[PDB]
Ligand SMILES: O=P(O)(O)O[C@@H]1O[C@H](CO)[C@@H](O)[C@H](O)[C@H]1O
């Protein structure tokens with residue numbers, strides 16, 4: 001049986017990927033870059049703040065100073081942080097609270113493997129901190145998603161091998177990170193976005209302990 005579940009946050013625990021998209025699109029349009037639509041935004045899911053900004057600046061082969069890069073990342077983060085102040089337990093996605101309670105009852109470890117520095121604040125907003133055995137700090141890894149380091153760190157933080165873990169993701173970069181860690185990925189979203197080669201569910205209500213156990217058995 002698996003011994004840990006390694007959760008991404010945005011698009012898995014709650015709909016904060018929507019707010020990252022809206023904030024990055026507003027920033028891009030302020031500097032004259034119009035290509036951040038929903039399709040392009042699939043490349044901005046899962047990756048660090050700095051890698052997200054650089055992908056946007058690439059779109060128009062745009063060159064800003066080092067000082068302006070720092071200011072733009074800060075502007076977008078300050079906006080996003082204002083948008084999430086009213087997030088509450090009512091915003092936890094269907095099935096997720098029940099899954100956390102069932103994993104804990106069965107002595108299965110729970111860890112966060114998010115590249116977002118806003119992860120701890122959001123788990124507090126949703127009254128979920130007490131369910132998590134560890135939060136992997138994204139600033140402590142040498143290489144961010146799609147590198148596997150953050151999933152390896154999350155498993156190690158709860159005393160379990162990546163090969164004895166499941167990872168839950170809504171991002172292209174994060175599915176690749178799980179694959180290269182040795183853990184088993186289960187995605188949530190559209191196969192048109194995330195691929196036809198791994199197990200994908202259409203919404204989070206499908207993330208039951210009973211479904212996870214069957215996927216493990218059949219891997
Ligand atoms: O700005 P933080 O909240 O630190 O990082 C965020 O991380 C998200 C999840 O990978 C990503 O989709 C965002 O573009 C990025 O700004």
Ligand code: NA
Nearest residue numbers: 124125126127
């Ligand atoms: Na709270």
